[PDB]
């Protein structure tokens, strides 16, 4: 017959191998598929979905409905931020649990832009200004409203538009970051003006926060760390 | 019908679809799907069941599928001393649309 020469790698089973294989049911007429709504062709389609950030992971707030709400109140006008969110989507406990983070935990490398979307859930009457800042990687996060204003920022008007979609850029020395450890930036929200309200309307509102990958986002080198 | 050429009457051949609890009275059966078979005129009655299933295929073991059921519409009339005890036979067959799959031989000793 055809003289062959069995090479190294013969009779080994590599779990990453991709060969043909004999069908155990070769005469069996498979149930044909139907057009179900919602076919996912890629996992990033699930990371491109605005999911809600848990900001308060304290002992009480966590694992409830309150861990997501950031409460704006009326107290002494301290320059410190309402929230400061580090942009370690995998190595930040807050973004780690989002859908994005759940998909990033399955991978080693990632690259792309994130879009954060804060959402005022207060009154139609209430008015005011927040300042949504973005410190780039390497920078030590802004501690006062002035430091934040001078850098990149968006003066969000609570009175006019009820959301604010700031998009982070892709800044990294490598073509890809890691999902574990080291910076990546900081979103941070300050009061520009203490929130005004009309009559006996409550002076304690809430802002929600969403995150999602952008169309430029990509991951690689699958790494499942799931076990018991 | 394997009775007399003389005998006359009406049977009602009903088909309850799957999920339905079978008809217990002639009225309940008539209101649903049915065929008033005339014993006097035509000696057979070919009712075809349809293919109703949630899946594209049923199982051969366990859960419904319907009920054929035959009632008297009229007690069978006969002429003179002709016997008043007739017989009906019943046949079944797949149709051209029938198909099976996933062979499962359970034959053993």
């Amino acid at each position: 017959g055809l003289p062959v020469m069995n090479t190294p790698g013969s009779n080994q089973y590599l779990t990453a191998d991709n060969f043909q294989s004999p069908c155990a049911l070769p005469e069996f007429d498979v149930t044909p598929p139907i057009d179900i709504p919602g076919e996912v062709k890629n996992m990033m389609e699930l990371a491109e979905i605005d999911t809600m950030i848990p900001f308060d992971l304290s002992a009480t707030k966590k694992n409830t409905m309150e861990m997501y709400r950031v409460r704006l109140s009326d107290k002494p006008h301290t320059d410190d931020p309402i929230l400061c969110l580090s942009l370690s989507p995998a190595s930040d406990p807050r973004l780690s649990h989002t859908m994005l983070g759940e998909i990033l935990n399955y991978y080693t490398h990632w690259a792309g832009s994130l879009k954060f979307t804060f959402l005022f859930c207060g009154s139609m009457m209430a008015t005011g200004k927040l300042l949504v800042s973005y410190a780039p990687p390497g920078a030590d996060p802004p501690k006062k409203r002035k430091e934040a204003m001078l850098g990149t920022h968006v003066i969000w008007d609570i009175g006019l538009q009820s959301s604010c979609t700031m998009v982070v850029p892709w800044i990294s020395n490598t073509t890809y970051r890691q999902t574990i450890d080291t910076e990546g930036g900081y979103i941070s929200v300050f009061y520009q003006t203490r929130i005004v309200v009309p009559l006996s309307t409550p002076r304690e509102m809430d802002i929600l926060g969403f995150v999602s990958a952008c169309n430029d986002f990509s991951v690689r080198l699958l790494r499942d760390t799931t076990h018991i | 019908f394997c009775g007399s050429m003389m005998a006359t009457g009406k049977l009602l051949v009903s088909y309850a679809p799957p999920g339905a609890d079978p008809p217990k009275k002639r009225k309940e059966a008539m209101l649903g799907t049915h065929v008033i078979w005339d014993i006097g005129l035509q000696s057979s009655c070919t009712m075809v069941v349809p293919w109703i299933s949630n899946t594209t295929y049923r199982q051969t073991i366990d859960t419904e599928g319907g009920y054929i059921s035959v009632f008297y519409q009229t007690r069978i009339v006969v002429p003179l001393s002709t016997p008043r005890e007739m017989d009906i036979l019943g046949f079944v067959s797949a149709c051209n649309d029938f198909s099976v799959r996933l062979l499962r031989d359970t034959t053993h000793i």
Binding site: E27, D29 | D97, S99, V100, R101, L102, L103
Partner: peptide
């Protein structure tokens, strides 16, 4: 409809 496995 398919009658291959009953061939």
């Amino acid at each position: 409809r398919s009658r291959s496995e009953s061939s």
